[PDB]
């Protein structure tokens, strides 16, 4: 029942690894393999299931699959025109050496959120497999992943995705025919057991929905992996064709997950073995994919499907943790901090970084209780700190290092003053339209995120141009300036 569950996890992890010891569509399918991880498939299964959200509020699968599109036509071509090897390069030359390090901290935080999401998904899967508590399972998974990252001493992304694709598409047909599950064509409009899974956006929340969509479709462009892969390709048309293939792949991958949420929503949980309380009354509603894959499906198929899905995700953490640790070692720390790989220095620092990243990721995975919340917050700080300047480096002329600090502080001021519902923080500026959610944390209905980004943008050029006239004639001697961008 339970102890055989470990064999299911172990037997697949080897195959995904031994085969890792061993025409252009492979590029598209390995670009699709960065975004479709352990959050997509589990968060967009949450968004449909939770009452009061529905499909209309599951804006992330559409958001990222459109960010991959808007990247190719507009950002891919003009980056290659000046030969930037990576996203770090444009910040270094025109904003100086050190500002590049300080402009990558929000990216590190975003990667920390993303890493926490995978730990959260893995914990739930292991918990349903062997009936252990969440509080222990996520810790165990974090320990295993962090240890294997450094004690471990080739197409690994292709294999992991071709296991998820088969695993989900083999169980969903069988669950949909279960006696408990009813017609899915009627519970999308007339609420047989719970509110219809096809969501709604009222006249009040239009601005909030548009603001979230802009945040979540314009905050995926400046990520590191996409711009690393696009820049490497030899042909410019090759890059955009790969981008469109990746968008298509994500859209096709987003179909099995939606059906799982609908199956979970349209079910009579009093007839199956989950008891009278629904997964919503008991605050266990992120487990919707594992729950429907285990209880509704028969014995043999669940043993294949759940094991394959878990083992596919297990190989995602090793890439992300190591990439973020190397990121911290080289871009945030080493720049202008002269050290070499000696006894007490950078490689020891990178060894230590892995432990801190794992501990922070699991600590935040334990505190927050929603995967979709983490996979939403992973695209906020980047959206409001990096993209506003990434626009000005590429197209705007005359941006100086002076302008960067003003926008940096101005956007963060409005963002942290606004407050967050997911992470418990109470607003301080109290934008009009605020209403209480749960008698506790207040929630605002004003596009303060987009307002903050736009304000950062319009101060970046303004103060930067002010400095240029400030350092020429009539107002200020040139000598007394901390930096010299003139
Ligand atoms: C799903 O829920 C239904 C109803 O909530 C459960 O069915 C009911 O189970 C009770 C338990 O013995 C049956 O006994 C009845 O109890 C009431 C209590 O007042 C009594 O007044 C009746 O004379 C009778 O003894 C009841 O007949 C039964 N009702 C139906 C329509 O089946 C059911 O057990 C739950 N679980 C499932 C279906 O897996």
SS3 for the chain is: CCHHHHHHHHHHHHHHHHCCCCCCHHHHHHHHHHHCCCCHHHHHHHHHHCCCCCCCCCCHHHHHHHHHHHHHHHHHHHHHCCCCCCCHHHHHHHCHHHHHHHCCHHHHHHHHHHHHHHHHHHHHHHHHHHCCCHHHHHHHHHHHHHHHHHHCCCCHHHHHHHHHHHHHHHHHHHHCCCCCCCCCCCCCCCCCCCCCCCCCCCCCCHHHHHHHHHHHHHCCCCCHHHHHHHHHCCCHHHHHHHHHHHHHHHHHHHHHHHHHHHHHHCCCCCCCCCCCCCCCCCCCCCCHHHHHHHHHCCHHHHHHHHHHHHHHHHCHHHHHHHHHHHHHHHHHHHCCCCCCCCCCCHHHHHHHHHHHHHHHHHHHHHHCCCHHHHHHHCCCHHHHHCHHHHHHHHCCCCCCHHHHHHHHHHHHHHHHHHCCCCCCCCCCCCCCCCEECCCCCEECCCCHHHHHHHHHHHHHHHHHHHHHHHCCCCCCCCCCCCCCCC
Resolution in A: 3.6
Per DSSP, what are the bridge partners of residue 436? Answer: 442
Residue closest via CA to ligand 1's atom 1 equals: 270
Q: Which residues of 216-245 are buried (b: 16+ CB within 10 A; e: fewer)?
A: bbbbbbbbbebbebbbebeeeeebbbbbeb
Determine the residue of 178, 179, 270 to mutate for testing ligand 1's pocket, defined as the one with the most ligand atoms within 8 A of the Cβ atom.
270
d(C-alpha 90, C-alpha 79), whole Å: 9
Residue 27, both tokens = 């590029």
Q: What whole-number distance in Å separates Cα of residue 323 and Cα of residue 157?
A: 15
User: Residues 20, 158: contact at Cβ < 8 Å?
Assistant: no
Give ligand 1 pocket residues (Cβ under 6 A): 270-271
Q: What span, in angstroms and rounded, lies between the C-alpha atoms of 198 and 266? A: 12
Tokens (6 digits) for 450? 């987009």
Largest Cα–Cα separation, the chain: 83
Experimental method: cryo-EM
- Cα–Cα dist 279/307, whole Å: 22
The region, left, alpha or beta by phi > 0 then psi within -120 to 50, assigned to residue 35 is alpha
> 164 and 41 in contact (C-beta within 8 Å)?
yes
Distance of CA 192 to the CA centre of its chain: 33
Residue 267 CA, ligand 1 centroid: distance in Å: 18
Cα distances from 13 to residues 17, 20, 92, 167, in angstroms, run: 6, 11, 41, 14
Q: How far is the CA of 290 from the centre of ligand 1 (A)?
A: 28
Sign of CA dihedral 119, 120, 124, 127: positive
Pair of tokens at residue 468: 């240029």
- Whole-number Å distance between alpha carbons of 396 and 399: 7
In this structure, the residue with its CA closest to atom 3 of ligand 1 is 270
- Atom from ligand 1 closest to the CA of residue 272: 39
**Measuring from atom 5 of ligand 1, which residue has the nearest CA?**
270
**What ligand 1 atom has the least distance to the C-alpha of 271?**
39
Q: CA-to-CA distance for 311 and 294, rounded, in angstroms?
A: 16
Looking at the DSSP bridge assignments, the partners of residue 87 are none
Ligand 1 midpoint to CA 282 (Å): 22
Backbone angles phi, psi at 442, to 5 degrees: -80, 150
Residues 329 and 337: their CA atoms lie apart, in Å, by 11
* CA 166 from centroid of its chain's CA atoms: 23
Residue 184 CA to ligand 1 center (angstroms) comes to: 26
Tokens representing 413? 């001021």
Residue 333's Cβ-side half-sphere holds a number of Cα atoms within 13 Å equal to 18
Spatial contact of 258 and 62, defined as CB atoms under 8 Å apart? no
Residue 96 CA to ligand 1 centre (angstroms): 73
Distance from Cα 194 to the centre of ligand 1, integer Å: 21
């Amino acid at each position: 029942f339970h102890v055989e569950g470990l064999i299911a996890i172990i037997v697949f992890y080897l195959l995904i690894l031994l085969v890792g010891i061993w025409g252009l569509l492979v590029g598209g399918f390995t670009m699709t393999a960065t975004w479709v991880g352990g959050g997509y498939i589990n968060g967009t299964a949450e968004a449909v299931y939770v009452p009061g959200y529905g499909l209309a509020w599951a804006q992330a699968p559409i958001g990222y699959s459109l960010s991959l599109i808007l990247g190719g036509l507009f950002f891919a071509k003009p980056m290659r025109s000046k030969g930037y090897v990576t996203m770090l390069d444009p910040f270094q030359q025109i904003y100086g050496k050190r500002m590049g390090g300080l402009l990558f901290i929000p990216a590190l935080m975003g990667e920390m959120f993303w890493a926490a999401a995978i730990f959260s998904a893995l914990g739930a899967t292991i918990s349903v497999i062997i009936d252990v508590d969440m509080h222990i399972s996520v810790i165990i998974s974090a320990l295993i992943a962090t240890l294997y990252t450094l004690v471990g001493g080739a197409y690994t992304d292709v294999v992991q995705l071709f296991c998820i694709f088969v695993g989900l598409w083999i169980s969903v047909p069988f669950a949909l025919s279960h006696p408990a599950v009813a017609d899915i064509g009627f519970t999308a409009v007339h609420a047989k057991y719970q509110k219809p899974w096809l969501g709604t956006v009222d006249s009040s929340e239009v601005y909030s929905w548009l603001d979230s969509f802009l945040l979540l479709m314009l905050g995926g462009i400046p990520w590191q992996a996409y711009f690393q892969r696009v820049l490497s390709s030899s042909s410019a048309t090759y890059a955009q064709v790969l981008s469109f293939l990746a968008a298509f792949g994500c859209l096709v991958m987003a179909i099995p997950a939606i059906l799982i949420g609908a199956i979970g929503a349209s079910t009579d949980w009093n007839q199956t073995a989950y008891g009278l309380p629904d997964p919503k009354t008991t605050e266990e509603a992120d487990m919707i994919l594992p729950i429907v894959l285990q209880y509704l499906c028969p014995v043999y198929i669940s043993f294949f499907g759940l094991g394959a899905v878990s083992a596919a995700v297990m190989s995602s953490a090793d890439s992300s943790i190591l990439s973020a640790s190397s990121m911290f070692a080289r871009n945030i720390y080493q720049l202008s901090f002269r050290q070499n790989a000696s006894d007490k220095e950078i490689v020891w620092v990178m060894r230590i970084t892995v432990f801190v990243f794992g501990a922070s990721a699991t600590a935040m995975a334990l505190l927050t209780k929603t995967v979709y919340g983490l996979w939403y917050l992973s695209s906020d700080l980047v959206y409001i700190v990096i993209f506003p300047q990434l626009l000005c480096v590429l197209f705007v002329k005359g941006t100086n290092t002076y302008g960067a600090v003003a926008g940096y502080v101005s956007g963060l001021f409005l963002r942290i003053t606004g407050g967050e519902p997911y992470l418990y923080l109470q607003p301080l500026i109290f934008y009009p339209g605020y209403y209480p959610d749960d008698n506790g944390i207040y929630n605002q209905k004003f596009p303060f995120k987009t307002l903050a980004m736009v304000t950062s943008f319009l101060t970046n050029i303004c103060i930067s141009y002010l400095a240029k006239y400030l350092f020429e004639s009539g107002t200020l001697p040139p000598k007394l300036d901390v930096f010299d961008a003139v």
